[PDB]
Amino acid sequence: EIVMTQSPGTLSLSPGERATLSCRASQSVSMNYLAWFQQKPGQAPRLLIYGASRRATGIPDRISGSGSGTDFTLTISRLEPADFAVYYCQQYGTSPRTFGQGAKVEIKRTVAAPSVFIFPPSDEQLKSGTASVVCLLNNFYPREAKVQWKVDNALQSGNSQESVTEQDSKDSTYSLSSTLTLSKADYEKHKVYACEVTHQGLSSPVTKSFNRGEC
Amino acid sequence: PGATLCLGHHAVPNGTLVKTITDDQIEVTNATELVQSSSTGKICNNPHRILDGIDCTLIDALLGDPHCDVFQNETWDLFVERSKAFSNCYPYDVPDYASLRSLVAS
Amino acid sequence: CISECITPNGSIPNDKPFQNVNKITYGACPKYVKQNTLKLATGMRNVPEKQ
Amino acid sequence: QVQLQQSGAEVKTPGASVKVSCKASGYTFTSFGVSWIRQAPGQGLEWIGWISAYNGDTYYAQKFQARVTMTTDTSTTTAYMEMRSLRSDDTAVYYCAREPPLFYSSWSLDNWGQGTLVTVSSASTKGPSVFPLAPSSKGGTAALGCLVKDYFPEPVTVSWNSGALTSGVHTFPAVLQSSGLYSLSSVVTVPSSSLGTQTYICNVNHKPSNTKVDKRVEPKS
Amino acid sequence: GLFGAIAGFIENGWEGMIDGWYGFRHQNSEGTGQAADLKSTQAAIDQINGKLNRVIEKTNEKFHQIEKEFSEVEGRIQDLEKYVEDTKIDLWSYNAELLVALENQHTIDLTDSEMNKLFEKTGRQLRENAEDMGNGCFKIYHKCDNACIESIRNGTYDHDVYRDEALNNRFQ
Amino acid sequence: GLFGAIAGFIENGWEGMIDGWYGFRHQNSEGTGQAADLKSTQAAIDQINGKLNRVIEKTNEKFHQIEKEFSEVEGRIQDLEKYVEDTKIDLWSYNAELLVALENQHTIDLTDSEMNKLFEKTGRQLRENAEDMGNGCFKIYHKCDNACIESIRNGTYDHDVYRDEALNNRFQ
Amino acid sequence: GLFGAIAGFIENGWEGMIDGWYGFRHQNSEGTGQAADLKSTQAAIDQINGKLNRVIEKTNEKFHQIEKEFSEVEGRIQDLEKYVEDTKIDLWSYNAELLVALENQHTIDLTDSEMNKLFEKTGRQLRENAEDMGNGCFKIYHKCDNACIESIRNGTYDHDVYRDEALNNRFQ
Ligand SMILES: *[C@@H]1O[C@H](CO)[C@@H](O[C@@H]2O[C@H](CO)[C@@H](O[C@@H]3O[C@H](CO[C@H]4O[C@H](CO)[C@@H](O)[C@H](O)[C@@H]4O)[C@@H](O)[C@H](O)[C@@H]3O)[C@H](O)[C@H]2NC(C)=O)[C@H](O)[C@H]1NC(C)=O
Ligand SMILES: *[C@@H]1O[C@H](CO[C@@H]2O[C@@H](C)[C@@H](O)[C@@H](O)[C@@H]2O)[C@@H](O[C@@H]2O[C@H](CO)[C@@H](O[C@@H]3O[C@H](CO)[C@@H](O)[C@H](O)[C@@H]3O)[C@H](O)[C@H]2NC(C)=O)[C@H](O)[C@H]1NC(C)=O
Ligand SMILES: *[C@@H]1O[C@H](CO)[C@@H](O[C@@H]2O[C@H](CO)[C@@H](O)[C@H](O)[C@H]2NC(C)=O)[C@H](O)[C@H]1NC(C)=O
């Protein structure tokens, strides 16, 4: 089957600049039937371009497709806040129809450091046998951040999951939550709990901690 | 074996009815209206200079009726004369009123 | 607001060639006609799919 | 307005079946085809297949050839997609999109349904437990929140002060734990000063489990 | 129409062709497909646009106007004012009605024409390797894969290549 | 005409066809005959009627009229009355003349068209079993009795049945 | 055009045909040549002349005229005189613009038509001894010397004479 390859997977650009997205196909796309779709979070894809250069109705002149054969490009001439979204290409030339994976355009911003907070487990939750420690990184940029957990200064692995928000409407920042999960036993077994955040906007790594059973 | 190549045109679910030489009502895919049938209901104050004459008739503002005094040295592209208008000054009459009003309004 | 064509009913847009609003006008204004609708066909004859 | 209306979210255990519906309106239904496309959470688009509401033709991706059958019903102007022998990786959002009436045509997927989420899990329904994330400052700006843990299936609603609190709030996407239950945290940033005066209540609503819960957050010294 | 193609020997329209005014549907060994034809679609569109602009251009009437409404009955002069305005309005109404009619008849005939031209063009390309079925479809008497179909749609189709196969298939 | 069928490649009209506008004359083993074709005759008639009604509909002018005749010379106002009426009359005369011309040219072209369409239709039906003689007559290369002729006139003619006989007769 | 012959399937015009509007270029064993076709050239010319005369005939306006210029401002009556004249002038300007447009569109379509008719006529004459190349040229499948070419140009060409040679050349 035909292999659609989009690059690069993420673009950071500022509104008013021009975005250029690449789609290469493992082999020649028959008829140059290649479409571009746009998907915002939570919504369904929209058809942007078909036939590789042709705009689906209700679409601006600023969004335009180009290219042929193996090599295709989607261009956006003036970026408006509604254009920041994920873009997919697909080749409908043959069966099976195939999509590239997820080129995402996002808002370039002044680097901004995360505000870090650390929350101990609720006693109520301890009642039920499990301890959850939460580390919150608030309103930063860019999205890349490293959250490392330390228990009695032991670097943890495998016991924490993390979730990230979507670039904020107003300040164009991200937030992130790391959650460490323990059996009550293992929890009360140690004392110092710490969360060490490395980010592009911190001259050096910030650590936020507590000691279990303190005030 | 062989193959079949078929020529065709497009269509829409609900078309529009138009008039032709030979048909009073016939359905095409799309049409546009050539008669402006509607108004916003209000007179736009650009580009033309619109002088709202309020309770004054242009002749009253000509003559200097007191409550019309706001109009001295006024200019206009379109002078809008209202129905609520009236004269509070010494009563008068203007032979060929229409034409005086006309040449002044001009 | 901005409208080049003024009638006593208020302003009307002059994009169209004809207007049914008022025979009294001021400014560049469509020619006044008695008809309230005239449709100009911008597409071919519509022949819906049989089924 | 060329609308494609898709059926409700489904929850199925492995081995089961699912049949999803798409009700088309605003165009002549037998003049087009319909194509089914799925997207797993935080993943790309995968084309399942195509069917002509016109001549009844059918094209399936080799992958789904076996487990999937597509149908259409002309009197209801409705397209259906049935998947059999479900595994858990079949969990995704399923979209139904309008396509040309013939396969090797020249345009593609011009109108999209809202999509319907099919969740394949052996986990039985459960409501969320809600614990506080309590603020403490080392006279500044402080953070607090709610940990909504161990529920199923998605979604969950979360609000603050019954909607009265918005600015500064972040509700993170759910994460799916090993147990098979989801969890997520909601978080607010507020002035430390208002900490001692104003009350903070988080309202969590889990529709599928028929659960509505309200918790509050205080430091406790 | 005048050329009897649209609502003519062409049975009906394809509502599922959203990418053009005119096009080809095909059937061959590989399957069946539907593709628009840009050149003719644009021919028709360009004509209709030109027409439209010709109609909505610089049509605005600008000069000083007489009094078109009167409060009190007068006599001669006003009777005349009214008469002038009524005459004017009637003439303009007539002009409008006629314009719309001629224009529309023409628009229909012209689109019909485009369809028919695209058809005659296709046939002439196919030369002796196909027959005109009469519904606006050609029977192609040789095996034609997708590449070949495209070659007909894009004008580069070389009939001499398939002539022998086709003739052999037609005449025995 | 525009299509060059009537007073075109069709030599002349048949005054002895009193039952229609268009038709077929045939010659075969059984004899010769002349029959009208209702579908096209009615196509043309319907169009021309529609046209006629469009022209004679709601064309009456109704509003209060000024004085159009004068006994004694006066001056300005009357000179103006006369001028208005003369202008009106000239514009309307022009409208009438033009209308009649456009309309008539069209009527002729449209009838021509109908003839030509009926002809192309017949040919397309005959497929490969006949040749176009150039005068508006087809040579049918197989034996065609009255039933068969009728089958062509009524649209149900199946060419595949006579194809072999006809081809055999054309090419040797 | 409407028939898509001129600026149609006919690639371009021949500036070196100074002796006619339409014609034939030929290539045969003897050489190549270019000759006008009088009948159709005159058809078109006669039509366009008729049209021209219809347009420039008896178009002059003759009746007593009001005062169309004024030195001093007056009032009602003059405002009315001006209004009448402006209305008149606008209506006539419109009539002129429309006339020219309709007329011209028609002239173009009609000439296109003549070309196409001459073409269809030629083809029908050639019968089965030639094929339509699609650019407005016929391939003649038998040896045709200058006399024969002329026989096609002057309408006396007898296809039955060359039928065997031609068919033999086309189908093997
Ligand atoms: C069926 O009918 C519709 C009208 O009833 C057609 O819509 C029109 O299509 C034409 C040709 O494409 C457009 O003309 C273009 O105008 C743009 C810019 O125009 C500006 O104003 C329009 C109208 O309000 C607005 O839509 C634009 O955004 C602009 O603000 C030019 O840049 C182009 O060069 C071109 O001339 C008309 O604008 C458009 N009208 C409307 C109301 O949309 C429709 O296309 C018809 N359907 C088909 C497929 O034939
Ligand atoms: C009109 O039609 C023909 C065929 O069209 C084509 O088939 C379709 C299904 C699509 O897949 C089209 O992309 C494909 O072109 C066109 O002729 C084609 O031209 C292209 C580009 O020059 C050829 O590509 C070449 O392929 C060879 C090997 O096959 C390579 O070595 C070359 O590097 C080169 O890329 C293509 O082969 C050729 N198709 C065939 C089968 O002959 C034509 O270009 C098209 N349009 C016009 C207006 O010319
Ligand atoms: C614009 O205003 C005029 C009146 O100022 C409207 O014309 C009147 O319409 C009513 C209802 O049809 C009639 O009874 C009157 O006799 C009309 N008056 C005159 C003098 O014609 C007209 O309808 C308005 N146009 C729009 C569209 O708002």
Domain boundaries, chain G: 1-172
Closest ligand, as measured to the CA of B41: 3
**Structural domains of chain D, with CATH:** 2-122 (2.60.40.10), 123-221 (2.60.40.10)
SS (H, E, C) chain F: CCCCCECCCECCCCCCCCCCCCEEEEEECCEEEEEECHHHHHHHHHHHHHHHHHHHCCCCCCCCCCCCCCCCCCCHHHHHHHHHHHHHHHHHHHHHHHHHHHHHHHHHHHHHHHHHHHHHHHHHHHHHHEEECCCCCEEECCCCCHHHHHHHHCCCCCHHHHHHHHHHHHHC
Contact D189, A114 (CB under 8 A): no
Say if the Cβ atoms of D187 and A100 lie within 8 Å. Answer: no
Interval between CA F31 and ligand 3 midpoint (Å): 72
Whether chain E has a CB inside 8 Å of the CB on A31: the answer is yes
Contact D179, D150 (CB under 8 A): yes
CB atoms within 10 A of CB A56: 22
Scanning B69-98 for CB atoms below 8 A from G yields: 96, 98
Chain C touching partners, 3 or more CB pairs below 8 A: B, D, E
Q: Which residues line ligand 2 (CB under 6 A)?
A: A 30-31; E 146-147, 150-151, 154, 156
Say if the Cβ atoms of E24 and B19 lie within 8 Å. Answer: no
Resolution of this entry, Å: 2.8
CATH number of F1-172, picked from 3.90.180.10, 3.20.20.30, 3.90.20.10, 3.30.110.70: 3.90.20.10
Q: Residue D202 and residue D218: Cα distance in Å, rounded?
A: 12
Instruction: Using an 8 Å CB-CB cutoff, list chain C residues near E16.
Output: 49
Say how many CB pairs under 8 Å bridge E and F: 56
Q: Residue D153 and residue E6: Cα distance in Å, rounded?
A: 55
CA distance A47 to chain E (A): 13
Q: Residue D45 and residue D94: Cα distance in Å, rounded?
A: 10
Chain F touching partners, 3 or more CB pairs below 8 A: B, E, G
The tokens for A46 are 């929209």
Contact G148, G157 (CB under 8 A): yes
Interval between CA D19 and ligand 2 midpoint (Å): 42
Chain D touching partners, 3 or more CB pairs below 8 A: A, B, C, E
Scanning E123-142 for CB atoms below 8 A from C yields: none
Residue A57's region, left for phi above 0, alpha for psi from -120 to 50, else beta, is beta
Contact B40, C10 (CB under 8 A): yes
Chain B touching partners, 3 or more CB pairs below 8 A: C, D, E, F, G
The tokens for D135 are 């603020």
From the CA of C7, give the closest atom in ligand 3.
1
Q: Residue D14 and residue D22: Cα distance in Å, rounded?
A: 24
Interface probe for E, chosen from D50, D107, D108, D109 (most Cβ of E below 10 Å), is: D107
Do chains B and A touch by CB distance (3+ pairs < 8 Å)?
A: no
Q: Whose CA is nearest to atom 17 of ligand 3?
A: C22
From the CA of E156, give the closest atom in ligand 2.
1
Q: Residue B65 and residue E54: Cα distance in Å, rounded?
A: 51
Q: What are the angstrom distances between the C-alpha of F115 and each of F37, F48, F151?
A: 11, 15, 19
CA distance G92 to chain B (A): 21
Element (H, E) at B30: none
Interval between CA B22 and ligand 1 midpoint (Å): 29
Q: Residue F74 and residue E85: Cα distance in Å, rounded?
A: 23
Ligand 1 contacts CB of residue C10 (under 6 A): no
Q: Which residues line ligand 3 (CB under 6 A)?
A: B 39; C 8-9, 21-22
Interval between CA E151 and ligand 2 midpoint (Å): 9
Q: Residue F130 and residue G78: Cα distance in Å, rounded?
A: 76
Closest ligand, as measured to the CA of B83: 3
> Where does residue G49 rank: exposed (0-12), middle (13-18), buried (19+ CB within 10 A)?
exposed
Q: What are the angstrom distances between the C-alpha of D102 and each of A13, C15, E31, E35?
A: 40, 41, 9, 10
Per DSSP, the three-state class of A118 is strand
Backbone angles phi, psi at A199, to 5 degrees: -145, 160
Q: Residue D48 and residue D159: Cα distance in Å, rounded?
A: 37
Interval between CA F30 and ligand 1 midpoint (Å): 63
Q: Residue A62 and residue A19: Cα distance in Å, rounded?
A: 10
Say if the Cβ atoms of G134 and E127 lie within 8 Å. Answer: yes
Scanning G72-131 for CB atoms below 8 A from B yields: 73-76, 79
- From F60, B77, B100, G29, select the one nearest E90 (Cα to Cα): F60
Instruction: Using an 8 Å CB-CB cutoff, list chain B residues near E29.
Output: 1, 3
Per DSSP, the three-state class of E145 is coil
Do chains D and F touch by CB distance (3+ pairs < 8 Å)?
A: no
Length of chain G: 172
DSSP string, chain C: -B-SEEETTEEE--SSSEE-S-S--BSSBPEE-S-S--EEE-S-B------
Scanning A190-209 for CB atoms below 8 A from D yields: none
Dihedral of alpha carbons A90, A92, A94, A95, sign: positive
Method: X-ray
Tracing tokens 């008739």 back to the chain, one arrives at B57
Say if the Cβ atoms of D131 and A125 lie within 8 Å. Answer: yes
CA distance B32 to chain E (A): 9
Say if the Cβ atoms of C38 and E97 lie within 8 Å. Answer: yes
Element (H, E) at A112: none
Residues of chain C immediately before an interruption (C to N > 2.5 Å): none
Dihedral of alpha carbons E80, E85, E86, E88, sign: positive
Say if the Cβ atoms of F48 and B22 lie within 8 Å. Answer: yes
Closest by Cβ to E26, choosing from B6, B26, B102: B6
Do chains C and D touch by CB distance (3+ pairs < 8 Å)?
A: yes
**Structural domains of chain A, with CATH:** 1-109 (2.60.40.10), 110-212 (2.60.40.10)
Instruction: Using an 8 Å CB-CB cutoff, list chain C residues near D31.
Output: 49
Contact C28, B14 (CB under 8 A): no
Do chains A and D touch by CB distance (3+ pairs < 8 Å)?
A: yes
> Where does residue F155 rank: exposed (0-12), middle (13-18), buried (19+ CB within 10 A)?
exposed
Whether chain B has a CB inside 8 Å of the CB on D28: the answer is yes
What is the separation of C-alpha B1 from the centre of its chain, rounded to a whole number of angstroms?
Answer: 68
Instruction: Using an 8 Å CB-CB cutoff, list chain B residues near C45.
Output: 26-29
Whether chain D has a CB inside 8 Å of the CB on B13: the answer is yes
Instruction: Using an 8 Å CB-CB cutoff, list chain E residues near C33.
Output: 89, 92-93, 96
Reported as half-sphere exposure (CB side, CA atoms, 13 A), residue B67 has a value of 11
Ligand 1 contacts CB of residue C43 (under 6 A): yes
From the CA of B37, give the closest atom in ligand 3.
27
Contact D212, D205 (CB under 8 A): yes
Q: What are the angstrom distances between the C-alpha of D59 and each of D10, D188, E41?
A: 25, 50, 30
From the CA of A68, give the closest atom in ligand 2.
13
Instruction: Using an 8 Å CB-CB cutoff, list chain E residues near C16.
Output: 56
Q: Residue D167 and residue D129: Cα distance in Å, rounded?
A: 25
Torsion of CA B14, B20, B24, B30, to 10 degrees: 10
Whether chain E has a CB inside 8 Å of the CB on F80: the answer is yes
CA closest to D58 among chain E residues: E31
Indicate the DSSP class of residue A56: P
Bridge partners (DSSP) of residue A134 are: A119, A179
CA closest to E55 among chain G residues: G98
